[PDB]
Amino acid sequence: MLLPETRNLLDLMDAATRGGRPGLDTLPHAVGRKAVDKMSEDGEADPPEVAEVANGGFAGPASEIRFRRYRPLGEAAGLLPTLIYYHGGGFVIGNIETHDSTCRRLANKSRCQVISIDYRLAPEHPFPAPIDDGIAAFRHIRDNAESFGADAARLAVGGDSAGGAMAAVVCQACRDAGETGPAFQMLIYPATDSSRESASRVAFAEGYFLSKAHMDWFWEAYVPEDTDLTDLRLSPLLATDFTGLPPAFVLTAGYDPLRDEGRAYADRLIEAGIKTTYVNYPGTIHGFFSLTRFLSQGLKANDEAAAVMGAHFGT
Ligand X SMILES: *[P@](=O)(CCCCCC)OCCCC
Spatial separation of the C-alpha atoms in residues 288 and 301, rounded to whole Å:
9
Binding at 172: pick from ligand X, a second copy, none (beta carbon under 5-8 Å per type): none
Whether 161 sits among the annotated catalytic residues: the reply is yes
Region 100-159 residues binding ligand X, contact defined as CB under 6 A: none
| DSSP letters for 58-93 | EE-SSSEEEEEEEEPTT---SSEEEEEEE--STTTS
| Binders of a second copy in range 93-122 (CB under 8 A) | 109
**Residue 275 engages a second copy in binding (rule: CB under 8 A):** yes
Tell me 104's DSSP state.
Answer: H
Single out the segment in contact with a second copy by CB under 8 A; choices: 44-52, 56-64, 165-173, 275-283: 275-283
- Residues 101/302, Cβ–Cβ less than 8 Å: no
Which residues partner with 115 through β-bridges?
69, 84
Q: Which is nearer to a second copy, 93 or 306 (CB)?
A: 306
**Residue with smaller CB distance to ligand X, 143 or 216:** 216
What DSSP designation does 223 have?
A: S
Task: Count other C-beta atoms under 10 Å from residue 239's C-beta.
Answer: 17
Listed in sequence order, the residues at least 6 apart from 58 whose beta carbon sits closer than 8 Å to its beta carbon are: 64, 65, 67, 140
Binding pattern for the stretch 205-244 against ligand X, x by CB under 6 A and - elsewhere = -xxxxxxxxxx--xx-------------------------
287 binds, among a second copy, ligand X, none (CB under 5 to 8 A by kind): ligand X
Cβ proximity of 168 and 184 under 8 Å: no
Nearer to ligand X, 151 or 160 (CB): 160
Which amino acid, residue 76?
A
- CB nearer to a second copy: pick between 172 and 277: 277
The nearer residue to a second copy, 163 or 254, going by C-beta atoms, is 254
For ligand X, the binding residues in 173-192 under the rule CB under 6 A are: 191
Residue 211 interacts with, from a second copy, ligand X, none (CB under 5-8 Å by kind): ligand X
Q: Please report, to the nearest 10 degrees, the dihedral formed by the alpha carbons of residues 164, 110, 256, 282 taken in order.
A: 160
**Residue 238 sits in the site that holds a second copy (CB under 8 A):** no
- 209 or 281: whose CB is closer to a second copy? 281
| φ/ψ (deg, to 5) at 279 | -150, 140
Active site residue 286: yes
Applying CB under 6 A, among 162, 169, 171, 308 the residue interacting with ligand X is: 162
| Contact in structure between 302 and 289 (CB atoms under 8 Å) | yes
Task: State the nearest-atom distance from the C-beta of 83 to a second copy, in Å.
Answer: 15
DSSP letters of 148-217? Answer: TTEEEEEEEEEEETHHHHHHHHHHHHHHHTTS---SEEEEES-----SS--HHHHHTSSSSSS-HHHHHH
Residues that bind ligand X (CB under 6 A): 10, 13-14, 17, 88-90, 161-162, 191, 206-215, 218-219, 287
Residues with catalytic annotation?
161, 256, 286
Residues that bind a second copy (CB under 8 A): 1, 109, 254, 270, 273-283, 299-300, 303-304, 306-308, 310-312, 314
